[PDB]
Amino acid sequence: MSGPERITLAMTGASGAQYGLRLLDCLVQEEREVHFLISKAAQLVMATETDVALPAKPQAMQAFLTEYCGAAAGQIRVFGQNDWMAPPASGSSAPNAMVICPCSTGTLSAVATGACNNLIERAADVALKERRPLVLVPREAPFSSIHLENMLKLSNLGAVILPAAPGFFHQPQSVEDLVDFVVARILNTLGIPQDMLPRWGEQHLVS
Amino acid sequence: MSGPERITLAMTGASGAQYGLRLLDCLVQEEREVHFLISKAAQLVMATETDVALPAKPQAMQAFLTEYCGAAAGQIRVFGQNDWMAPPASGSSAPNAMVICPCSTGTLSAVATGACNNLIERAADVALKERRPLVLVPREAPFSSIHLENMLKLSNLGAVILPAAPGFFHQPQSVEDLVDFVVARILNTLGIPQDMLPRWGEQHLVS
Amino acid sequence: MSGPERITLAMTGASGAQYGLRLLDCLVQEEREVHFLISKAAQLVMATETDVALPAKPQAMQAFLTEYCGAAAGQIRVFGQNDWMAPPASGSSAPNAMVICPCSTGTLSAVATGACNNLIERAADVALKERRPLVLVPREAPFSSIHLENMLKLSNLGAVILPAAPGFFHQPQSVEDLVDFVVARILNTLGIPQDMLPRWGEQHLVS
Amino acid sequence: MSGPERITLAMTGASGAQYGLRLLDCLVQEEREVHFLISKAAQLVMATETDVALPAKPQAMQAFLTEYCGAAAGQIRVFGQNDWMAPPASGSSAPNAMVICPCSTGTLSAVATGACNNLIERAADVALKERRPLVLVPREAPFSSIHLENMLKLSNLGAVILPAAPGFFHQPQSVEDLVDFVVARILNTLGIPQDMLPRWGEQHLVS
Amino acid sequence: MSGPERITLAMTGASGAQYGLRLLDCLVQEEREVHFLISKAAQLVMATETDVALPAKPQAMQAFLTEYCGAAAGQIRVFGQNDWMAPPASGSSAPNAMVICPCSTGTLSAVATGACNNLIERAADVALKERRPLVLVPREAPFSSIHLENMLKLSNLGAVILPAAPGFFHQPQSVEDLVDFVVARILNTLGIPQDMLPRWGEQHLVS
Amino acid sequence: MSGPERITLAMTGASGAQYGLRLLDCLVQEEREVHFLISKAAQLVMATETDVALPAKPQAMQAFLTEYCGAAAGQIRVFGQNDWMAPPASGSSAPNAMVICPCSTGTLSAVATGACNNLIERAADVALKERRPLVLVPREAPFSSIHLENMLKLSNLGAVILPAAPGFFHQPQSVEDLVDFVVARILNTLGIPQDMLPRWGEQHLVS
Amino acid sequence: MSGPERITLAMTGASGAQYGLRLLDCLVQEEREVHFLISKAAQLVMATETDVALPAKPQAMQAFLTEYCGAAAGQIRVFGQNDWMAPPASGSSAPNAMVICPCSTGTLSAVATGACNNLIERAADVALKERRPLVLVPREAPFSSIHLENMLKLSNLGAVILPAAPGFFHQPQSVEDLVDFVVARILNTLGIPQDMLPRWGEQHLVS
Amino acid sequence: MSGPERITLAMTGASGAQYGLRLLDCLVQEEREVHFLISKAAQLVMATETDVALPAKPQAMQAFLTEYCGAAAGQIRVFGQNDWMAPPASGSSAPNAMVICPCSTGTLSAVATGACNNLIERAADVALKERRPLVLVPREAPFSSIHLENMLKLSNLGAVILPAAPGFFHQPQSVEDLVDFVVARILNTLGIPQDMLPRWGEQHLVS
Ligand SMILES: Cc1cc2nc3c(=O)[nH]c(=O)nc-3n(C[C@H](O)[C@H](O)[C@H](O)COP(=O)(O)O)c2cc1C
Ligand SMILES: Cc1cc2nc3c(=O)[nH]c(=O)nc-3n(C[C@H](O)[C@H](O)[C@H](O)COP(=O)(O)O)c2cc1C
Ligand SMILES: Cc1cc2nc3c(=O)[nH]c(=O)nc-3n(C[C@H](O)[C@H](O)[C@H](O)COP(=O)(O)O)c2cc1C
Ligand SMILES: Cc1cc2nc3c(=O)[nH]c(=O)nc-3n(C[C@H](O)[C@H](O)[C@H](O)COP(=O)(O)O)c2cc1C
Ligand SMILES: Cc1cc2nc3c(=O)[nH]c(=O)nc-3n(C[C@H](O)[C@H](O)[C@H](O)COP(=O)(O)O)c2cc1C
Ligand SMILES: Cc1cc2nc3c(=O)[nH]c(=O)nc-3n(C[C@H](O)[C@H](O)[C@H](O)COP(=O)(O)O)c2cc1C
Ligand SMILES: Cc1cc2nc3c(=O)[nH]c(=O)nc-3n(C[C@H](O)[C@H](O)[C@H](O)COP(=O)(O)O)c2cc1C
Ligand SMILES: Cc1cc2nc3c(=O)[nH]c(=O)nc-3n(C[C@H](O)[C@H](O)[C@H](O)COP(=O)(O)O)c2cc1C
Ligand SMILES: CC(C)=CCOP(=O)(O)O
Ligand SMILES: CC(C)=CCOP(=O)(O)O
Ligand SMILES: CC(C)=CCOP(=O)(O)O
Ligand SMILES: CC(C)=CCOP(=O)(O)O
Ligand SMILES: CC(C)=CCOP(=O)(O)O
Ligand SMILES: CC(C)=CCOP(=O)(O)O
Ligand SMILES: CC(C)=CCOP(=O)(O)O
Ligand SMILES: CC(C)=CCOP(=O)(O)O
Ligand SMILES: [K+]
Numbered sequence A, B, C, D, E, F, G, H: 001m002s003g004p005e006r007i008t009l010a011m012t013g014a015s016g017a018q019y020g021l022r023l024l025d026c027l028v029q030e031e032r033e034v035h036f037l038i039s040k041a042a043q044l045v046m047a048t049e050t051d052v053a054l055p056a057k058p059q060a061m062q063a064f065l066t067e068y069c070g071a072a073a074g075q076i077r078v079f080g081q082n083d084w085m086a087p088p089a090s091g092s093s094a095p096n097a098m099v100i101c102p103c104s105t106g107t108l109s110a111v112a113t114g115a116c117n118n119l120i121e122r123a124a125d126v127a128l129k130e131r132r133p134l135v136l137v138p139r140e141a142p143f144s145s146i147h148l149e150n151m152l153k154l155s156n157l158g159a160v161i162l163p164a165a166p167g168f169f170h171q172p173q174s175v176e177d178l179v180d181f182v183v184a185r186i187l188n189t190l191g192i193p194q195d196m197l198p199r200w201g202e203q204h205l206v207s
């Protein structure tokens, strides 16, 4: 396979829960192992914006998502917000790429300042120190200078700041096509195959 | 009325032409005067992503948009890319709020560095020097550090950086609902009434 | 009326609970709507420094303050520290001015770094991104370089840093006169009428 | 009326005394209250460059300017350089917009560094801390890096740096037309009506 | 004794003359030698805000304060604003701790930029270069970014920025108790004994 | 002769075409060789603000200016905006001093960022890299922080930023006297003799 | 002659009055015209450290120094501290090199921040803006970070910071030989001949 | 005793060998233990500028200086330039204050950048990391921006930059009195008694 075998996927409490669930589904379809993390605010966001009845506690959540995505047993690992015994908490862990999708301004802040108040923030801290892939998907508008300064610092350190800003150049017809555009870009960034978003210009030889 | 009587609306060559056309339509419905500017690349974007057959030259374009939006004669002014005799080129002009929607990375760059290679860039330069409202709506992902540095500099100077990043917290059902979310935020930023996006929590008294 | 119709008033755990309660009382007397927030540490401060027996939970607190200030029903809204459904959590809310009085060094830090760990911090983040008024009233001495750097960053972004540093130039006779001096300055900053602190020099025509 | 009711007008010792006197005259014609301040060096500049025989001391000066401009009694207040009992010395004063016209490099420096060695410098310090309008009209050439750094710092803090650099695009025929161009720009900046400088392009609908 | 034998106490023209006089009284009671300096504006502040009839010239002032505080002959030295022959003007002097209480924004500025326009400013310059204690007690609100930048630079260089911001956690009953809180903090900073403000938590062994 | 034998004189599209034409005339009278460059926008400015009927293309322009100024054949060279074969395009050229008068904000920006989109911008880039004289004459008001940052960067690198800000201290009687003041300052900066503006104080021996 | 025909020599209130008087004497012996300025504190320094009975007022001072140095009539011009009609106050003056010897920390500060509170500070401001030579001779120890920051800013702008730090490598036998070392370095910096300090290594051909 | 019991005294290859030898003599007279280090270039400087016939190797050097200063056996320790077994090489050593007198620009550079190419540079690195006193005595003129940047960085970190810049305010009569002035300042900085330089103003009670 091209791309990482294992992805830490963290969902935090920005609007755009559909992006995280769709990414999770695509990662599972590409036979990747997913270490799944979710903040308390992201649970509230998912309750508000989707019809997904996500259980509260990690093992029920794991059973639930494994069924929701059609994953294999053990393919989705779920870890709680203070579970320091999980692989993402230490750089001695097997290497994973990490994506925070969606990324709240509060989680962006914690990662930029090194905060490490829950396992999502610590996992990001580990990714940066180990020079492992870290993709942040912020969903906010306007962006203040505080947001922008935090994104710049992390981009300068090699994190990918991929805002939930879909393009329209493949004539989307539905909300799902817009969600898929952003998910495609994430997968492209990770180097994981996807066929939702064609390769621009691939056919074009001259002019 | 609340908000500005006159808006300079510039469309540049980022994906998201639908945002600009919908904003234009809403401004017209709120009886605002619109000074409309469009880059050569934005004309190509509109051709590619929409079914709008926009004429090339300013007076035909003006006739066209006035009909497309149901505007009054003279309500939409269209100015070409080197028309220095237009109001936006000088700070001695009557005050206008300016929005660049969508804003390409190239136009973001020109505005951040002071470039002033066409009338859109000069108009933004004027807005900043006169301390008139300037809203930029970038559409790009990932954002590089170059993008982020340009957005930060302008945000620090009081421009509003409003990325084309719609939220999902009012359960959008269509592409149009997502377009309207971003347009609503722009209008809110300008202080122009809108009823596409309710006031969050306005009903909520306690808990 | 001059000034904002609605104020988010956050009390955090610095010494100076009397400033917050007096501001609350003045806002109510000027017929403003107050969205009231209070941190867990600020509850402890109020217990220690005042004889106000503030209830713990938001609806009892609301009933209590509405009586304490002589407010109208619904004039004071109280929201808990994780109540994301409250207006201050989103920039799509109706516009409010925000004051954090008193402001602890910890809350100053969170606002400067974008932290957004409770509703006070998120509300401040929203005020900054929406370019709505934000006044911070820090109470600390000495100020370290960490404090000063945090205040500078926020001042440069257009927040008003109004330290709880009363003047003596209108010959205060009591603790209450000093409290009122600072409250007056806050109201002046917000553009809300007050008659506790005269307009300096207003009578003086020459010399 | 549009614009501020009260303006602090400070004249400092740069060449361009005619700009200050013409602004003073226009403010008086627009029925504004003017708190007038003048430095010792600016008195020497006015003696050298104009035929205005300005008295030395504040009450004689006030009597003099009230007659020179055709102002109402009390419309022009004159305050001496150490008169801390004047409104501009305290932020508890009634709000005023402040203009320093012309602004010497020495006064620019004092305002940028926070110096507060006379009432002009203190008044500027107050305007900045209260977020009241502050317009500086420097007259110098070349500008050194020291000048430019001082202007940048103040511009970044929201002061308007309006150099005494008239334009020629309304075909000036006299020294007075050039003086009026700069005065017009100041009034435009303050939001005070003026009809010396037309609104650029106001007639132009297309091309 | 603990703490410095000699303190340079400078009073400058911020509101809060009571803090300086109370500190002076406490230093005298702790048998310290005080080199007392006072600015022209601080003389005006003391006239306005207090009933202390301070003589204008240094020897009469010295006689006056020695009586006002019950000091020993020679215990309070008073030096004029251009007296370069006084100990504080040279780093070859015997070591002293220096406090500027209250500190105006103008004096803060001079010390941060190295100005050295009177003996207070030069004495501060000397303290910094000799790495002798320097405590500044600013009294201002709001603080602008200019103030904050000046305080930060000096804090980074090891000056103590101690704003006149009293706490309420020992239930003050009078203006005097608030004045004493700030004076206590200054003495604590200098390492001089005081019994106005108890040692927080000194009794508390667990929980 | 004192001063440079050859000057590259670039006119760009700021108001103040009269300054460029008067400088050109003075350079010709001082028997200097002038490499003359003019932007497309500056052609429009000259059409609008002056009665000079400047031809469009370089050889007709050259014939025209040689007659307008009374120059010798070959004394004024005119080069088009993409003429890379002209001396100013390479640092291997014979040394010239360069003046951009007037300098638009857009040209200021290009020079500060190194843009090199036409021969004026490239010529400035060459002057800086070769450490040859470069004088910029901006005409704009207000100056934004973007302008000021661009001017500062270039001043720090040894360019002379000479704003079109005439003084009044030699009692100008006409628009021409103000134009001549700025032209005089440019010539002084270049070290070229001029007798329009006397040497200040040259007669004054004492007091 | 090599070097400047005219030197502005400013003496300020640092220890090292002997350096200024010796430089003055050497400039006179090299037939240079000297525009001499002296601060009030430097007058006190000269009284304290030397046996030179310098008169207080500019014309008596001029008569005095012309005799003390054996100068020609008119060769030394003396200008008072507020004499704006003197050549050094304007950049339109004939070009001069400027030396501040000795330079106090207070004058260093004023020049670095652009202060322009007397004619010495303004003259330095003019030298920098006109890119005329400016040499500062500070005498202080230790140097604080404030001093060092001020010297760095001015050095980066092309001022020469020449501390009064004599070398011993030509085996000085007297205080005068040390004074002459520093004076020699100043003259070398200005490009004025001197034969007090030989050219190091001038005889040495190999090894 | 007041002050440190042990001083690391490093001599490097700036002019001013007399300062180092005189400091060494004074430290010995105050019964301090001296860890003496000397660079290869400083040996050449001492040969050139003094009549001291310093032996090359550490034990002969030690015998020599112990006799030259009248020290006790073991009071002066001499360590070679690569002797890592000496106390100054490790922060686990007993605490010492360190002085580099004189300090060359090359040694200043090494200390500012952390170089640690000989035992002098490493000893300074250790002093900084352990927060032990470090005094640098540079002898150079002019100071370039490189020097000044290096001194600033170290001053900001709490090193004392004490340039070899003697004052004249105690009317020196000989080269030795100037050497003693600088040595006095060093001892004052270290807190070691000295009676070469009186305490300025110690007698002065008023005026
Ligand atoms: C429905 C809902 C939508 C939200 N949308 C956003 C959003 O788009 N962006 C954002 O930064 N915060 C948003 N928030 C707020 C955060 O959830 C909040 O600041 C929280 O503290 C983030 O915590 P976390 O980073 O641990 O997930 C939203 C909250 C709710 C309830
Ligand atoms: C179909 C199409 C879509 C594009 N989408 C984007 C985009 O989303 N963001 C962007 O920065 N540039 C995009 N570009 C590229 C720009 O149009 C291009 O860089 C151009 O130079 C911008 O010029 P302008 O700023 O004058 O409009 C797109 C171009 C095309 C043709
Ligand atoms: C009685 C009391 C007084 C306090 N006074 C202050 C104060 O003046 N300034 C401050 O920054 N913190 C003070 N604190 C500490 C804070 O309350 C503490 O750091 C807390 O974490 C702040 O949390 P918050 O910002 O959520 O309110 C005080 C705490 C108590 C109990
Ligand atoms: C006739 C005259 C013209 C002056 N022109 C200027 C000028 O154009 N720009 C400037 O910065 N200073 C100029 N100055 C110098 C200042 O007046 C001087 O630096 C003074 O210290 C400024 O003090 P102030 O800022 O309190 O007015 C001029 C002085 C005189 C006498
Ligand atoms: C009654 C009175 C109260 C003042 N209060 C303050 C104050 O609280 N803070 C401040 O920075 N300046 C205040 N000022 C202004 C200063 O005194 C003024 O800016 C002055 O130039 C400071 O000079 P100094 O630093 O030499 O004392 C006050 C002045 C007066 C007369
Ligand atoms: C009549 C006229 C006057 C102008 N005046 C100015 C001006 O004073 N300052 C400025 O920066 N731009 C001014 N402009 C705008 C510029 O000409 C424009 O931004 C252009 O892109 C500059 O291009 P250039 O730098 O290649 O000349 C003016 C334009 C016109 C037509
Ligand atoms: C005898 C004497 C010696 C002084 N020596 C110095 C000195 O070496 N360095 C210094 O910066 N200030 C020294 N000062 C202090 C200044 O003179 C003082 O800070 C003054 O404000 C400087 O003003 P000026 O820059 O206008 O000359 C000395 C003062 C006196 C009286
Ligand atoms: C006689 C003599 C005098 C010197 N004077 C100085 C001086 O005053 N300042 C300086 O930085 N370097 C001076 N140098 C140069 C240095 O000694 C040289 O740059 C050397 O590399 C410094 O090495 P060090 O730092 O290991 O001692 C002098 C050299 C010699 C021989
Ligand atoms: C949870 C854990 C073992 C953390 C230590 O990880 P690492 O050495 O900091 O990468
Ligand atoms: C097109 C035009 C008249 C530009 C000059 O505008 P401004 O004086 O720079 O605001
Ligand atoms: C609680 C909530 C709906 C947060 C989203 O607000 P916004 O789009 O970030 O201003
Ligand atoms: C002259 C005076 C009362 C200054 C105090 O004003 P403020 O509290 O600093 O705005
Ligand atoms: C007033 C005086 C002797 C100043 C010189 O002091 P220092 O050498 O700069 O500490
Ligand atoms: C037009 C030309 C030959 C450009 C190369 O010039 P240079 O080597 O960059 O100074
Ligand atoms: C004293 C005087 C005429 C100052 C103006 O000089 P310049 O135009 O600022 O160089
Ligand atoms: C020569 C030596 C033992 C160096 C180690 O010292 P340290 O642990 O770095 O202070
Ligand atoms: K959590």
Ligand SMILES: [K+]
Pocket (backbone or CB within 6 Å): B039, B040, B041, B081, B118
């Ligand atoms: K274009």
Ligand SMILES: [K+]
Pocket (backbone or CB within 6 Å): C039, C040, C041, C081, C118
């Ligand atoms: K909380």
Ligand SMILES: [K+]
Pocket (backbone or CB within 6 Å): D039, D040, D041, D081, D118
């Ligand atoms: K004055």
Ligand SMILES: [K+]
Pocket (backbone or CB within 6 Å): E039, E040, E041, E081, E118
């Ligand atoms: K004073």
Ligand SMILES: [K+]
Pocket (backbone or CB within 6 Å): F039, F040, F041, F081, F118
């Ligand atoms: K062009």
Ligand SMILES: [K+]
Pocket (backbone or CB within 6 Å): G039, G040, G041, G081, G118
């Ligand atoms: K003076």
Ligand SMILES: [K+]
Pocket (backbone or CB within 6 Å): H039, H040, H041, H081, H118
């Ligand atoms: K060596």
